[PDB]
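Hi team,

As requested, here is the filled-out complex form for the zinc ion run. I kept the field names the same as last time so the parser does not choke. Let me know if anything looks off before we queue the next batch.

— J.
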Amino acid sequence: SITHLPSKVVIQDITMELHCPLCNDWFRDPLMLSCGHNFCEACIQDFWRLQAKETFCPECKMLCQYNNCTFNPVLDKLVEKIKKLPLLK
Amino acid sequence: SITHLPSKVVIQDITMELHCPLCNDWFRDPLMLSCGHNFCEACIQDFWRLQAKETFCPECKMLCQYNNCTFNPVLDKLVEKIKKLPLLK
Ligand SMILES: [Zn+2]
Ligand SMILES: [Zn+2]
Ligand SMILES: [Zn+2]
Ligand SMILES: [Zn+2]
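And here is what came back:
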């Protein structure tokens, strides 16, 4: 995209990217799946253990293998920082 | 950390987290290594091909295996968004 965006809209977009789509809260110990999507470790583990018959990604439906999941620590750092951001608009 | 931070300081901290430590520019097609650190794909590939005798992480020095690297697409999305943020302070 090549359009200017309202400051508040950009902050909100950034914030949506740091929210887990399973719990709709801030990522906590996010795992990244083979497709590149991220979920709280607890959220994706419970989804797979409890709701899903194969280990697929809830967002894109691609078949991930459990053993290919990896921690995504940069997301923890970004969550910590942005929660401290004063929203001046 | 449990201290309030200046808005501008928080934006700058967030921005440092979205910069590749090898090139000091915005992440472009970042790969995440087994240790959880991220670098532009081109940057870490050139580092390993050209400067380094084993595939270690330039930040933490841990021995990563090349085949365990993964794309970290969330970082591309965050780079795109934050570059559009008007800096009002
Ligand atoms: Zn979650
Ligand atoms: Zn996915
Ligand atoms: Zn780079
Ligand atoms: Zn590292």
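Two things worth flagging: The first strand of chain B starts at residue 30 and ends at 32. Helices of chain B lie at 7-17, 41-50, 73-82.

Thanks,
J.
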